[PDB]
Design a protein around this ligand. Structure first.
Ligand SMILES: NC(=O)[C@H]1CCCN(C(=O)Cc2cccnc2Cl)C1
Ligand SMILES: [Zn+2]
Length: 139
C-alpha cells in the first residue's frame, strides 16, 4: 500500500484504488497501473522533474529503504495477475531489488523529489510506475 499526496491530488496504484478514489476520479490509466483522485486537504509531497536513474525506495515487506539504479520509463511485458491480463505496462522502470505484492505503493525518490511508486516485482526485480511526466500534478 501507499500513495503520493501532491496539491489537491492523491496518486495510487490503479489496482489498489478504493471506492472513494473512484468517486473522486481525476485521471486513470490501466496501461500505467495509475489512478489519481482529488482530495480536500492540501498535500505537499513534491514531484521530481528530472532524468535521474538512481534513487531510494521504501520496501514495506522489509520495513527498510533501499538504494537502486533503475531503467528509463518504458513499455515492459507484465505477466497476468488477478488484477490484469498479461499485457505491456507503459512508463515502467525496473531495478534489482526486493518486492512482494503488498509492497505496491512504496515511494521511489531521488534528490529532486518523488519519482514514482512500486507497481510490479518478482525474481529479485522491482518495477516502479513513473509519475515525473505528469506535469499537471503541480501545474
Ligand atoms: N502492475 C501490475 O500489473 C501488478 C499488479 C499486482 C500484481 N503484480 C505484481 O508484480 C505483484 C508482485 C509479485 C512479486 C513481487 N512483487 C510484486 Cl509487486 C503486477
Ligand atoms: Zn532527480
Amino acid at each position: 500500500s501507499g500513495a503520493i499526496y501532491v496539491g489537491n491530488y492523491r496518486v495510487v496504484n490503479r489496482h489498489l484504488a478504493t471506492h472513494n478514489d473512484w468517486a473522486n476520479l481525476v485521471w486513470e490509466d490501466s496501461s500505467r497501473d495509475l489512478l489519481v483522485s482529488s482530495t480536500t486537504a492540501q498535500g505537499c509531497d513534491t514531484i521530481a522533474r528530472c532524468d535521474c536513474q538512481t534513487g531510494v525506495y521504501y520496501c514495506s515487506s522489509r520495513r527498510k529503504h533501499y538504494p537502486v539504479s533503475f531503467s528509463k520509463p518504458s513499455l515492459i511485458f507484465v505477466e497476468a495477475s488477478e488484477y490484469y491480463p498479461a499485457r505491456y505496462q507503459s512508463h515502467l522502470m525496473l531495478a534489482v531489488g526486493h518486492s512482494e505484492p503488498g509492497d505496491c505503493g512504496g515511494i521511489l525518490r531521488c534528490q529532486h523529489g518523488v519519482v514514482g511508486i512500486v507497481s510490479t516485482g518478482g525474481n529479485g526485480l522491482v518495477g516502479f510506475a513513473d509519475v515525473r511526466d505528469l506535469l499537471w500534478l503541480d501545474e
